[PDB]
């Protein structure tokens, strides 16, 4: 594995290089929007982002070393978390608003009880802005979500090594985070505190993801908002 041989700086560059692109919505400010058509834009947007996420995951150091089955598991577990932290990140410089797309910037008033999740997403963005989150820190957190969210649900002596391999990569990412904060001129006390603050936010991201997953199941049963085959496939993986 080459993930265990990358320096902190080399780890950062690898993650920044692998960054998915910001996609545009097919939203049209002239055309009117029902709550279902607006939701359709977002789910369509989430679908296209997923494809870029999957190819992003491949470039995450340590991920390709895992078995194909383990990769599927981790992605099935963290896909909505990764979407949300991405959304939150690019919404940092737009207070009170969520930048789903460069042409789609919404506030909480623009609908249907998804509003609670919308507010939590705003509060997370506000938290990142207050903490002055850096891009190098963001890509680290995102990779942590990928490897950590599904590791506690994977029996043998051989599988044991795979999970241990995952945690070993997590440690290297932790090291990378500490290296960044140290370069930023923070004291050891300030490094440990900021590290704690960042990782605690991942707990909140898990919460929003669980809530969002619940709504996605309800939208499926409602059968009004269109959902892609892949999105339904990721959704059913959680409802099991």
């Amino acid at each position: 594995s080459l993930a265990l041989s990358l320096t902190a700086d080399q780890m950062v560059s690898a993650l920044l290089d692998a960054e998915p692109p910001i996609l545009y919505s097919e939203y049209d400010p002239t055309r009117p929007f029902s709550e279902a058509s607006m939701m359709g834009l977002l789910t369509n947007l989430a679908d296209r982002e997923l494809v870029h996420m999957i190819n992003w995951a491949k470039r995450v150091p340590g991920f390709v070393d895992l078995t194909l089955h383990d990769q599927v598991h981790l992605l099935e577990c963290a896909w909505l978390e990764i979407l949300m932290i991405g959304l939150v990140w690019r919404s940092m410089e737009h207070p009170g608003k969520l930048l789903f797309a460069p042409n789609l910037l919404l506030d909480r008033n623009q609908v249907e009880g998804m509003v609670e999740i919308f507010d939590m997403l705003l509060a997370t963005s506000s938290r990142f802005r207050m903490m002055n989150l850096q891009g190098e820190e963001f890509v680290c957190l995102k990779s942590i979500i990928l490897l950590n969210s599904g590791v506690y649900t994977f029996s043998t002596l051989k599988s044991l090594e795979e999970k241990d391999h995952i945690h070993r990569v997590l440690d290297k990412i932790t090291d990378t985070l500490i290296h960044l904060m140290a370069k930023a001129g923070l004291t050891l006390q300030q490094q440990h505190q900021r590290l704690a603050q960042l990782l605690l936010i991942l707990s909140h991201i898990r919460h929003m993801s669980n809530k969002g997953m619940e709504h996605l199941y309800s939208m499926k049963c409602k059968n009004v908002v269109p959902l892609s085959d892949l999105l339904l496939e990721m959704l059913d993986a959680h409802r099991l």
Binding site: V51, I54, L68, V72, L75
Partner: peptide
């Protein structure tokens, strides 16, 4: 297994 298909293309 769409995810599995995309993970090796």
């Amino acid at each position: 297994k769409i995810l599995h298909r995309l993970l090796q293309d």
